[model samples]
Target: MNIFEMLRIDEGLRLKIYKDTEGYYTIGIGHLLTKSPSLNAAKSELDKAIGRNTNGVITKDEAEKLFNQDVDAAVRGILRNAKLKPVYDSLDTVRRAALINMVFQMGETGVAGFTNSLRMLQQKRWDEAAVNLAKSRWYNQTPNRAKRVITTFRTGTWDAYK
Candidate 1:
């Protein structure tokens, strides 16, 4: 994929926190400010970027750069955390990516609460881990995504079990 082409998606780009395409407050590359200290910083940064009370737009370059930095930080976090590092490193790349995405959605602390799931994963009990993951609130909220994750945990493929 060409770098230029990747930049042209132009999907969730937005301007203001209070004012956005979706009802919720968001800004800068469409980074959703959710319930966590990590995202809360983004909220504060957006507020500060727009002068605490006003609104504005960020260049696509700005958003891309921010997104890359945020992603790098998230990966680094998983690699650095003592509890997650060993487990993350032991998994295959596909499973590792899935774990990272879970952390991305829920934060490390949130993902860390999956004691049974992580234990199954660390033990390479893929099917058991899939079952455990299926029982999660995150799974309930995002059935399609959870199904995909479970399928991958079971078979290392992105699609349904085969």
Candidate 2:
């Protein structure tokens, strides 16, 4: 069996609230309970059944809600203010999306620290910028993703997208 099946068998699925071996409140799969929609937090309880008056359970809806918010935060976290705006705005949507994606992986502060790379970008030195990006620790850890992003940074063509 694969890892997903392994996890299913190992963790076992639970639709109802239960107490873990450590006695913490928990829900579906082995995900530990943290928040409740009712806003009343539930403490440790016996696991024979899902008790009433407990915090609500999670579903994909809640996960997606947080996903949307996280993405929004990442997008917003990309370069702001005067110095970087014009340079960023000059990029095509492909490049812009690539940059935002890099910001998401590296965090705004992390990407912003690439002053030399950004300077190359600002000067429209696409090849130099591509080289700089490829030379980064980020590129080392994430070669495929960096390759795709740097391709767009260099070629500025939709075909450069992967």
Candidate 3:
């Protein structure tokens, strides 16, 4: 099945695939006319997420291949865009994944919830980081997802499958 089909995405906006603490958060299609993403721009965003240069033109099939390619570059670009390059510099792989999940899905506002939590990690406060990770909106709003990503953040594996 196509990735969108698996996602049960009802309409085709554009895809933006990135990995977070939860393993993956692939945003489905969204309209391009708020500020208005050109069809080319929208498709390029999708292609870029998957590691392809649209060069201003994209086939429908090319647009569809975005979900499974590497998400690291895309995530890093987002970090740079947000000026959160330190996460790339200092965080462990799992924690980086957690941040990516939060930043990409919830935006900077989402990540701000973990300010103290991240500080604890910076201070080598594992238990505190765990506690803070458990206490954020990312946790309170989606407790099940919280459990999964925090487990991924605490451990270096996404295998809990929570």
Candidate 4:
């Protein structure tokens, strides 16, 4: 079970296979995603987006490493940004997992962008969770894409996305 499988792409392990931001080439339905700012090489450039970062470039493997590092940071960010470590401590595993998924999709910076959502979560305001998740550039930027992840977080099936 992986992120795509959890997200219900209805496919097995493979490269990104659907249309994504910048028209990235996907493997199968959604194995892994390969994208470049130019909106071109998604397949031939499978490892193309490597070496670039939020600021500079380093190694070809930098993308995966950077993305993952930020992902972990994003998850930890849930506690930090919401000031909800204690609140999170009391929640069920499902809630914690949902935040992790949200972090992975949104990234640390992306998750930080979701200040409203964080506040709602901190307040244990489930009703506002959906609304809070909805209010964002992330939410409006990529309609379905945002729904795909935020919905998981709002509901309890976030980990189930993978």
Tell me the tens digit of each residue's lDDT in model 1 across 27-69.
5554555433454555666656544433345666656665666
**lDDT (C-alpha, whole model) for all candidates:** 0.64, 0.58, 0.51, 0.52
Better candidate number, 1 or 4, judged by TM-score: 1
Clash total of candidate 2: 0
lDDT of 3 by residue, 49-141 (tens): 546664444444444443222234347554665345664457776666666655544656556556677676666566667877886656776
Q: Per-prediction count of colliding residue pairs?
A: 0, 0, 5, 13
lDDT tens digits, residues 26-142, model 4? 433232455554434443444444422212223324434544554456557766755546545655666665566555554555565566677777677776787777777666866
Error of 2 at 64 (Å): 3.1
Instruction: Sort all candidates by lDDT, best to worst.
Output: 1, 2, 4, 3
Return whichever of 3 and 4 wins on TM-score: 3
TM-score of each: 0.71, 0.58, 0.52, 0.51
Comparing 2 and 4 on TM-score, the stronger one: 2
lDDT of 3 at 62: 44
Candidate 1 TM-score versus the reference: 0.71
Candidate 2: stretches off by over 4 Å? 1-59, 79-83, 160-162
Structure candidate 1, residue pairs in collision = none
Worst 10 residues of 1 by lDDT: 1-10
Best model per lDDT: 1
